[model samples]
Target chain A: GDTLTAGQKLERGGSLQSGNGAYTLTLQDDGNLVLYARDKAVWSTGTNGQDVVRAEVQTDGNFVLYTAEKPVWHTDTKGKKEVKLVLQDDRNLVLYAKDGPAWSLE
Target chain B: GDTLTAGQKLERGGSLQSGNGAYTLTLQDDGNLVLYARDKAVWSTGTNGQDVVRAEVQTDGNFVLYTAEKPVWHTDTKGKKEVKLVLQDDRNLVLYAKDGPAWSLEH
Candidate 1:
């Protein structure tokens, strides 16, 4: 299928690699990403694929793992510094942090 | 416009004010809300919007601004203290906070 498109841009400033089960994404301070999938060093921020970093979920909505000044991977949905929330009034689902909705119905 | 519907329930534990462009939302403890819109405060928790204190987004996603043990306004999006992220498979975006994450991007 076309789940992953060419030049589709999975994530920026980060790397996304397809592994056995999940993908290993890394990000950098310089705003780059790297990906390692299928047990193989697959993608990177700028193709160099050389960056040491720590990955974390920002307040906005990006899945990022970085290394020092280099990027490892990114989900792309980068948001602001203040923990943001997509309050879906219709769904009544407010996805805030990892604990899920602080409060919701249905 | 039918935008501000009475019982429209914009936000909980928070006050909503419909002045000109946006809505004034406030939240508090005990989870109370107060709304001030259209230049006239017209809503509240159990119908009361009187509390003191500061408002903040606690890492998660709750719009909570508390004063005392009582509640003034609350978006009810209150989250944890440590910064967190909401990854939407469909929307490829990443967000960090407090000068962290160093680098980032969007879709």
Candidate 2:
């Protein structure tokens, strides 16, 4: 499955794909973070045309969309350890940490 | 109003009360954080008999019960600024930060 470990990042053109290659999460050069299924759009952060520099999984357990040192959007899920983001084969995307799911979309 | 602003603290016996004096939130000597309405218990953090030394409203926007350096209980609300804990006249308690409510309880 697609996974971004804690403290990892995705620059433009970087991606994570589902284990079965059925889903893909892409960081577009235009700063948008998009997810696709079967080559069709499924979900996105909609930050296209923004000044986003990277999508990061922060050490503090927060998932943030950033521009250099500033945050433009976040999951607001901070305060734990072992945080990770996963695009599951079950057709869901989730952020997990502290023994639970901090954010998710099914 | 009963409010603990960011960077404030509540040691044992320290408290916040509603504007109308109808409700009180007390950090008792035994380390319990309790809420009372007309002298009757309505809610509590249930930390009584624990090792809490102080209750702090953190600048990072979290509310925590601490023991010198370690945390025993927390509201787990962080990542913002201008945090505060308010005990309201409507018999509700709320933790606010970054232009919105971070935590609360009713009844």
Candidate 3:
């Protein structure tokens, strides 16, 4: 649907949605979120101002941007008690809430 | 037979004179004596200090030396229990009376 050619750089946490399951995310050396809706990338979190961080998923359902193990941006999904999950839309990623629907790729 | 010339570097408890059983002695990375005879190198004390540091046999029967663990250069033999064995010009290398002639190299 969108217009994305091959070899385009995807920023950290940046995702591209080509169809449904055909999606990809990038983690630049500097942590930043750039979402792509097919050939047209849609969103970005502007690397916390400057740059110098990488984003990663925590075991507790928090998508975090970090610089050398230190966190910059963090998803506020904490202390859910049971089991929580997060999914990237498209047929590729999914997360859940207390084992429920936290995220879904499809 | 006397003056060892090649890679000559023998320290305490170091021996090369093997005739009867042909025992060669070497220190482990941390603690333990290594005996090598002929093409066959026999006898090793094994590792005691664990990781972060290496195993190496000390001068005394007590080859104990540790870094990540604790003290280093300690022998397997311990206590006021005559842990002091000797390796004279004649004697080889053994353990003790209880452990048997603590320094036979031949024994």
Candidate 4:
């Protein structure tokens, strides 16, 4: 419920929250993956544009943004067996793959 | 980091949160194991006296509250092997043990 495993799509209006419930990461309808601490915006994926559909965390360990078929943006950490995309209590959104290739919200 | 396997103690001041960060179960310094959604408390072990030392999820699949060598409260799910205490994203606190015996917040 809180994680995006490999081969999963976080569709628009989908979200993940930190264990402490202090932070949230939402795949906005505008194609932006935004992180918020309560009601305040703290970070974003910088892909705020129209017609952006879903965010996919691929088994290749890549986090990609797409419309219907083509990819618009990605974290570039593909080619791995994906585990989960977690929003940790530390207020960090992390993509935990095979533990070798990963990404964080910074 | 989210799952508490058997033979582990959720000591005072320790906590475990759901994978989605929607729920948190904290072993408070006040000796109370409280579950909260964000900042509002939703549930608790209800032992709020004093000297409550730690909250232990035993290998036997029993969840116990202890205060200095004495058991104050317990979930009574004893007699088992290694287990895990997980606070699920659905707001359910579940204890899974060795596949033989288990417990949940269903009571």
Candidate 5:
């Protein structure tokens, strides 16, 4: 689990890896939030199109897709911070923030 | 456009109609942001799932979907206040706040 600030971009081909370096959350330039195991997309946000330049996991617990610093799509989950996107061994992609789970791809 | 405060609800069968009553913005329990004309959804935010109880066009210019008192989804367009959600004749759903247009289906 890791924390990310507002407007911090995870560009295309970039990833946020797990502590063990096993799981990865990649931001595609096409505007998709993808959870991969090594090199495979186990789950995804399915958000695409537009001039999507970046993806940000906001402190509000929302995983947002953006273009020119403006929000295009999001998970819409908001609350507390200390948020982290994790890829579980069970192939589940989960967003954990505050006291609960914000989103999951099972 | 009319102003809406925080926590104000727009229920399932309710709508925020335009000044001329020609266009409308309906709050659906399924959590979709729909712009309607008479009764047709022209442009919409395809948001759903969870126990979507109601929708609130927040003062921050964000259209939020909620369950109980917890927010499940939103437009994420935060900033200024005195926000209002409008349905235009062009069928675009726009959110206006303190400074200017915050979010729109046309974007």
Candidate 6:
């Protein structure tokens, strides 16, 4: 399965695909963590703009899109350390921590 | 608001409480990742032993109980990196991976 960590990023046109390769977490050049199933945008962050250069999954559980040090957009999720974000084959963008689901696109 | 790292652990009787102070994630001496709503056990891993010295939420997204290097028990949830397992105020023991919830004991 593909994943991203804090400080690592997905530039425009980049993406994180699920284990089955049926779903994709794409960083649209316009700025959104869009979940695409069959090339259709089913779910997304709905963020915007040229201010967003990349997307980052931070250690604190916040997934943010930024232009340098300024955040143009974010998930507004944070504070839990060691949290991870993964794009599941079901096309759900999920946040997992502890032993269960903390948040999901579903 | 309370969290644990991959290498970090909760010893027997140690716990991670929720931000609202309504829930708890306890490492029982009996060896379980038990969630409590007040004093009631709402959810748990249901494993046992003296072999389970501590519970560690690994970076690979697995919550494991161990005695030294050997794992006595685990959540069996793995593979996604940068994930976090949290004990929510709703008494849900959750694994947050991407932008959403990956798994949960929604009690």
Q: Score the docking of each candidate (DockQ).
A: 0.05, 0.02, 0.00, 0.02, 0.02, 0.04
Please, what are the lDDT tens digits per residue for candidate 6 over residues B2-106? Answer: 655444667888887766677676777776656777788766656655345576554655445664333212234454445654433333334567656755555
Q: How well does candidate 5 score on lDDT at residue A2?
A: 34
Score every model by TM-score: 0.22, 0.33, 0.22, 0.32, 0.29, 0.33
Which interface RMSD does candidate 4 score?
25.9
lDDT of 2 by residue, B1-107 (tens): 36555457778788877666676778898878777777898767787766566776545443567643222123455463455544343434445555676556542
Candidate 3: tens digits of C-alpha lDDT, residues B13-106: 4444433434444434543434455557444434333321322222221123233322211123332233322222332222343344422234
Superposed Cα RMSD, model 6: 21.5
TM-score of 2: 0.33
Q: What is the lDDT of residue A28 in candidate 5?
A: 73
After the best TM-score superposition of candidate 6, give how far the Cα of residue A65 lies from its true spot, in angstroms.
Answer: 53
Of the true interface contacts, the fraction found in model 5 is: 0.00
DockQ of 5: 0.02
Q: What TM-score would chain A of each candidate receive against the reference chain A?
A: 0.24, 0.60, 0.35, 0.58, 0.46, 0.52
lDDT of 5 by residue, A1-106 (tens): 2323343546677766653655666667776666666566666656655445556544443435654423333346655354544333343334565567666544
Candidate 4: where are CA atoms >4 Å away? A1-106, B69-107
By lDDT, highest first, what's the ranking? Answer: 2, 4, 6, 5, 1, 3
What DockQ was computed for model 2? 0.02
* DockQ, Cα level, model 4: 0.02
Q: What would the per-residue lDDT of candidate 3 be over residues A1-106, giving only the tens digit for each residue?
A: 2222221323344433333533333444444454444465444446534353443322322233443322121123333323322111221222234445432324
lDDT tens digits, residue span B1-107, model 5: 33233335566656665556566666566666566666776666565544455665334333356543332224576553555544343434445655776655556
Two-way TM-score contest, 3 vs 4, winner: 4
B49-105, model 1: which lDDT tens digit per residue?
434333444333344433333211111222322333322243222333345432223
Clashing pairs in 5: none
Q: Deviation in angstroms for B3 in model 3?
A: 45
Report the C-alpha displacement of residue A24, candidate 1, in angstroms.
61
At residue A51, candidate 1 shows an lDDT of 38
Model 2 chain A: weakest 10-residue lDDT segment is: A67-76
